[PDB]
Amino acid sequence: SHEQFRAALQLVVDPGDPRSYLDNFIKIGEGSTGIVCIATVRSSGKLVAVKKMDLRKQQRRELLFNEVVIMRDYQHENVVEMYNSYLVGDELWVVMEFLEGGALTDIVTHTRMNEEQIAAVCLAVLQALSVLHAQGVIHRNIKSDSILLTHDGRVKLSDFGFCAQVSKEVPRRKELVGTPYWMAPELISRLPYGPEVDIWSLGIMVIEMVDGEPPYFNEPPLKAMKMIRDNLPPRLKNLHKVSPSLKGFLDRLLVRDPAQRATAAELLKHPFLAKAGPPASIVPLMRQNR
């Protein structure tokens, strides 16, 4: 069954082994699906990132195809570019754009973002989501760990390992997929859901950018889930810090009823996003500049 799955992946990946053109693999990070390494392109000295995912260690292997579908089909300015995929032993390797500024997580855990920076991040994320959603793709893992930065403060959406597609023939998804504290209540309720779940998850990320962490982050994941499902929309710990404009924006995101929650395309017109600064405004938040 593992051997069966290897053979199958082999038919859809690029042939060969990128070890032949890459040097100095250095681990920089982990996920539940696998690790991330940087590597040097031998011929040129350029840097790339390489995601390595062991086929035997997945919750659900079939999700590994998401990596290949998104690469083949759904590219954009605010989406991490995937270059090639290979089967190397028992691992799927994906060679992709290196986002040398790291993940938004390191920022929200160590500094305070102002609203211009928050708005720039939301704007960038929402542009990527408007396009993904309009083509049937739901990310399902929106949180600060999935948002990556360039050295000059450009924002890109990453980690498509958990995504799903919808369409006329399959309008909703039913799988329990995401990270507990960021999951939409309808998803936790096991209701059929759509792209709207990404919008709730973004709201929780806005909570991360204002508070440093999502709500109920001290509760075990299952208790946190229960509270998300049953209670009113979670509140910012320091609501007193945010402008009325940020709060009105957040109120369009953290809406329990998915039918009433704003869409990505709606949100792109919200006056909060008029505060968005340029990428340069994000630059000082990064570890190498703080």
Partner: peptide, 9 residues
């Protein structure tokens, strides 16, 4: 608690 790990099915 404080888990950043994902859940599938």
């Amino acid at each position: 608690s404080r888990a950043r790990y994902e859940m599938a099915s």
